[PDB]
Design a protein around this nucleic acid. Structure first.
Lengths: 58, 148, 159, 49, 51, 185, 222
RNA sequence: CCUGAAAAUGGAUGGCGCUCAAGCGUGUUACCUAUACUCUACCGUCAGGGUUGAUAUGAUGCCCUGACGAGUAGGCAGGCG
RNA sequence: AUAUGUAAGAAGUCCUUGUUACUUAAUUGAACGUGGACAUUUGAAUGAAGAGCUUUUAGUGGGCCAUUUUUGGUAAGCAG
RNA sequence: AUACUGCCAGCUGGGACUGAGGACUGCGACGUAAGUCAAGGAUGCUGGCAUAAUGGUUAUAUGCCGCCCGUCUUGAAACACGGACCAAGGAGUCUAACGUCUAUGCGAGUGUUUGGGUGUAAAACCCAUACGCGUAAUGAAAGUGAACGUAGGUUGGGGCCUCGCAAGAGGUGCACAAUCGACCGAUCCUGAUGUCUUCGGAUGGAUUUGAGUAAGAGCAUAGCUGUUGGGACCCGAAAGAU
């Protein structure tokens, strides 16, 4: 017995019930996937700023 | 109890909550862990990665008592000293009368250094010790004496 | 059987252009992309490395990573009932700066400039854009513009 | 047979386990019988410990 | 407890609109206007009456 | 007919009237509904809803957590307020003279506080001393560190603690968990 | 705290002062209304005098009433009817006329009748069926205090102040218009005047833009 | 409008019947009536609020305001036995 | 044509570096910063019925019919 | 000086349905000064009848409407299946191990109940062993084992810490989310003093990795729901075996 093969009928309606919300955005995205050379250097630069800031507001 | 169950609330409704089309049949997908590689693969892989196959070496006649080595962290070390004398020991922190902490007598095999003991000297009797836990104990003025 | 390869149904999408084949003009390699830049994706069919998937043709994203020849682009893709964050490693030939983005930045500076001029005198500059408004009343003079009367034409064959 | 995120269990009940089920209903009964046996036994050896 | 509609119930009308007294008294619903004979140009009637 | 934009007859989704049958908790609720309505103090509003919270949503607060809270600058003399149990921490060797208001204190927690010379008051005593929540510092315990939550969101490439009974070699450390056996997650 | 005359005298005096300025403002609106309509008339006469044609300004306000039920509406006009607050048949709202809102109206054309309301029908709409959205609740206007308590920060103190902000589309139209609950009109008292509603007004139907004939339809619906 | 235009029980512009129609094209109105719209009452649900006031009124009590109500499979709740 | 991506700002914008082991010929930049200048217009419209988020679990996993687009078929109350 | 259009907070009539709601308040109107009013919901007057007269119930008639229920199904009144009728019986249970949630006790602990002691005798009550789970992870393992920072920095963050009399900031920020770090184990590297010269072991690291640490949260009992094994919601094979 043959059945129905495929239809996207009702699929858009289902996807809109509690649906298509955009992904929540953040300040400070994850530094994964960015260049390690930039990541390694960024770690040193952020460290110095925290030390530099701490000295200023001692 | 029976009177709070939904079986009472399904009385009068034909299918008892199991549906008219796909009913409550006996074992529609197999029994127990059947088909875990075949038709339950989508569940096994999602929730139980690592389930199939073998990983390491075998150990015949493994006696669990051999590996009995409960750990005592340094932040918990002063809980072995009894409460009545504990206050006396911290306030009278001094060599030549340091409390003796028999860690094995309490039921611990190894002593780990989770850190921040007070600088009160303590004698710590242990079977096994961690490098940092002995380091921190000396910096508090105390010592670790290995007990068999 | 059915066929769904990486570049299926890309016959005209990845076609180069009419009288625009061959080597790419070098200004595309002179454009600079920083993290946060809004870029469009138009795949160049001559350059086969760092090629976006056909889904990403015409998609606009934000740069998050800058490598030797490529930029990481974040693109929101609709998968089912929610958008998923996708990260594209695209060579520069397949992207260009969004022009609307650059136009809005000029408005940001123009809005700040207009606020500076108005703050000198307080004339309610009203930086906010407005929709096209219904027309105001006007008077149409007829001198030299006498109305010319029109009628429906009769039907005729013209064959 | 296998369904949503749960611990995988091993309940060994594929034999005729229901025949070999012992409920210790006589916990109270055995304790009383044991104390009686201790009581009578001590009497028979009346001075002994 | 009960909504009363102005344009009926003159009392609720006067509560909302104190000017309803003046508008009524001066009959500003029926107010005359002065007249002056500003005649449209002869071209305007020729265009309208044009066949 | 109405073209409805949202679901009709939708319940609020927050708790009111705590699920507990404890009369003394209900007594504290009726006191703090009154305060949250007649005082305009935001402190009374959060205490009222905190009293509705379930046990997992009221994680314990150790005296260590309170001692760190009292080390905030300007916070040494504030009244530490916790809606739930205050537990005793043996990992500290010094406790300040603070006042702590809480639903419950463990024996060690209460003994620790009174020995340092402070007070262990309930939330009805705090209300008499601070009807507007003056000079208070609300302490909440760690809610995402309990055992159940580390299994939430479990799936491929999530790192979320499988639901497992026996732990060790040959208990889900194989195909699907390492590249030497098939693939890794 | 004897409290018989002192407190009530001040409140009535404050109410009396608010009435005097509402009276003064309503007189000014009537003068402005009458001036604008005559000035349009005078301009048409003057253009005719100088051989020219006076083109009246495009209407700035439309009243749209949903004339179709809620079943079988495609998603895009259904979204537009929701953003225009027309979720029931015969529900009506005012719309400030702009290209952004005109394109909205052309999308929902098969489902609504709209046009250019005059001052008379707006006054009658607000007086008869006027409800404010207050704390997400539909409370009848029925009093000047109810508008002043919710739109007084924008200077709208009376019902006529609210009507004025609608008829002559003012700077605070959006706040004044959204304050009004969507108008809930009846079916027309004498009918729709056509055998079939669901054709365009131009085609002898009922939907779409009927420019000034919305006044007859709305007044018979109100 | 007529011819073209033939199927099997007796027979169906729904039927009667209708011929300057009660037919057909069109225009103009008047009129009829849905569980729809407007208004009002009452039930319920949900939401938002008020209320520590007198020698009467447990504060999940009392009260105010608004909106809403189709339902198989199914879920939950409050109840009945 | 219809459909479709993005943007229309407080995580935004205007200073000789403040940091770095990255980068530059180079205080050149890159990224992230400290201090400074910006609530009724917070940088189109309309609406928003409270946002956002989590856990857990039922049923379902035979579909069918308008209009429009459309494939196979003479066609079908046919198949897709 | 008019069959058209628009407006009137213009006027004068004729019908219908409704009367919700306080032991005391509001907004207003009307005379130049006892106050009245159609102004936050019906009163006044007058009849007839204290009874099946109104009304409830039920039977019939009348007007209009109304296919037989359950089931499977896209679709049932079906020329689909079960059902001649009635009574009684008749179908998601209990247990072992559990997931979420919730309630309760105690809390870095928790669980008395194998047992012992008692007892008004399977109750109840009591017990300063052990054991289970938790308090440490990670690695196949041998093994090693969680703060040089106020248990870190950044963003947000409820609440808290002044008021100034109608724009109105700053400080502290323990839940939690995002993020950059730090610590423990594994992997891959460096291999210092020293030394049964072949052992020993980093302070130095790495787009590596862990179900980790980073001032514990768990243990126990109960309940709904869900899971697995069980006869497993109830009934039902053709078979197979001794």
């Amino acid at each position: 017995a043959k059945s129905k093969n495929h239809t996207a009928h009702n699929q858009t309606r289902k996807a809109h019930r509690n649906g298509i919300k955009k992904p929540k955005t953040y300040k400070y995205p994850s530094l994964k996937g960015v260049d390690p050379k930039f990541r390694r250097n960024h770690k040193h630069a952020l460290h110095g700023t925290a030390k530099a800031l701490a000295a200023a507001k001692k | 109890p029976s009177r709070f169950t939904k079986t009472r609330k399904h009385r009068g409704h034909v299918s008892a909550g199991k549906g008219r089309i796909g009913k409550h049949r006996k074992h529609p997908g197999g029994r127990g862990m059947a088909g875990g590689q075949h038709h339950h693969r989508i569940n096994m892989d999602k929730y139980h990665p690592g389930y199939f196959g073998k990983v390491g070496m075998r150990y015949f006649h493994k006696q669990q008592a051999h590996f009995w080595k409960p750990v005592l962290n340094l932040d918990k070390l002063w809980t072995l000293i009894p409460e009545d004398k504990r206050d006396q020991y911290l306030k009278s922190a001094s060599k030549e009368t340091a409390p003796v902490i028999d860690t094995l007598a309490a039921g611990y095999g190894k002593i780990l250094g989770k850190g921040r003991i007070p600088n009160v000297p303590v004698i710590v009797k242990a079977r096994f010790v961690s490098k940092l836990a002995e380091e921190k104990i000396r910096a508090a003025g105390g010592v670790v004496e290995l007990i068999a | 059987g059915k066929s769904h390869g990486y570049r299926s149904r890309t016959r005209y999408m990845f076609q180069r252009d009419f009288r625009k084949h061959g080597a790419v003009h070098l200004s595309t390699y002179l454009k600079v992309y920083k993290v946060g830049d809004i870029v469009d994706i138009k795949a160049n069919g001559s350059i086969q490395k760092g090629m976006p998937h056909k889904f990403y043709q015409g998609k606009t994203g934000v740069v998050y990573n800058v490598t030797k020849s490529s930029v990481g682009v974040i693109i929101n893709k609709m998968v089912g009932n929610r958008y998923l964050e996708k990260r594209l490693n695209l060579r520069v030939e397949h992207i260009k700066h969004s022009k609307c983005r650059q136009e809005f930045l000029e408005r940001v500076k123009a809005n700040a400039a207009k606020r500076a001029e108005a703050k000198a005198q307080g004339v309610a500059v009203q930086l906010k854009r407005q929709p096209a408004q219904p027309r105001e009343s006007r008077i149409v003079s007829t001198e030299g513009n006498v109305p010319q009367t029109l009628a429906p034409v009769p039907y005729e064959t013209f064959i | 047979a296998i369904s949503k995120n749960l611990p995988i269990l091993k309940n060994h009940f594929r034999k005729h386990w229901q025949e070999r089920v012992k409920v210790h209903f006589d916990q109270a009964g055995k304790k009383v019988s044991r104390r009686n046996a201790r009581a009578t036994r001590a009497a028979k050896i009346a001075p002994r410990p | 407890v009960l909504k009363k509609n102005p344009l009926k119930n003159k009392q609720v009308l006067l509560r909302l609109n104190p000017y309803a007294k003046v508008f009524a008294a001066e009959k500003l619903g029926s107010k005359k206007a002065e007249k002056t004979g500003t005649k449209p140009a002869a071209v305007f009637t020729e265009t309208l009456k044009h066949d | 007919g109405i073209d409805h934009t949202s679901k009709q007859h939708k319940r609020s989704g927050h708790r009111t009237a705590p699920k507990s049958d404890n009369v003394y908790l209900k007594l504290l609720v009726k006191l703090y509904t009154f305060l949250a309505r007649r005082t305009d103090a935001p402190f009374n509003k959060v205490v009222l809803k905190a009293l509705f919270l379930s046990k997992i949503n009221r994680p314990p607060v150790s005296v260590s957590r309170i001692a760190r809270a009292l080390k905030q600058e300007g916070a040494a003399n504030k009244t530490v307020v916790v809606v739930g149990t205050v537990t005793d921490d043996a990992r500290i060797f010094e406790f300040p003279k603070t006042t702590v208001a809480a639903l419950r204190f463990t024996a060690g927690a209460r003994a620790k506080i009174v020995k340092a010379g402070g007070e262990c008051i309930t939330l009805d005593q705090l209300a008499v001393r601070a009807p507007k929540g003056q000079n208070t510092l609300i302490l909440r315990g760690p809610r995402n560190s309990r055992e159940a939550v580390r299994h939430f969101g479990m799936g491929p490439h999530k790192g979320k603690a499988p639901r497992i009974l026996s732990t060790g070699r040959k208990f889900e450390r194989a195909r699907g968990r390492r590249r030497s056996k098939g693939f890794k997650v | 705290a004897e409290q018989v005359a002192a407190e009530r005298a001040a409140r009535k005096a404050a109410n009396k002062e608010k009435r005097a300025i509402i009276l003064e403002r309503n007189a000014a609106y009537q003068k402005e209304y009458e001036t604008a309509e005559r000035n349009i008339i005078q301009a048409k006469r003057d253009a005719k005098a100088a051989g020219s044609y006076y083109v009246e300004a495009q209407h700035k306000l439309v009243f749209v009433v949903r004339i179709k039920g809620i079943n079988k509406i495609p998603p895009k006009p259904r979204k537009v009817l929701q953003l225009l607050r027309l979720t029931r048949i015969n529900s009506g709202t005012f719309v400030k006329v702009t290209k952004a809102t005109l394109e909205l109206l052309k999308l929902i054309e098969p489902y609504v009748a709209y046009g250019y309301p005059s001052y008379s029908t707006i006054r009658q709409l607000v007086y008869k069926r006027g409800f404010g959205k207050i704390n997400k609740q539909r409370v009848p206007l029925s009093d000047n205090a109810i508008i002043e308590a919710n739109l007084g920060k924008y200077g709208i103190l009376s019902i006529d102040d609210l009507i004025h902000e609608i008829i002559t589309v003012g700077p605070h139209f959006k706040q004044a218009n959204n304050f009004l609950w969507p108008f809930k009109l009846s079916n027309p008292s004498g009918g729709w005047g056509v055998p079939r509603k669901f054709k365009h007004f131009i085609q002898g139907g009922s939907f779409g833009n009927r420019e000034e004939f919305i006044n007859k339809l709305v007044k018979s619906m109100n």
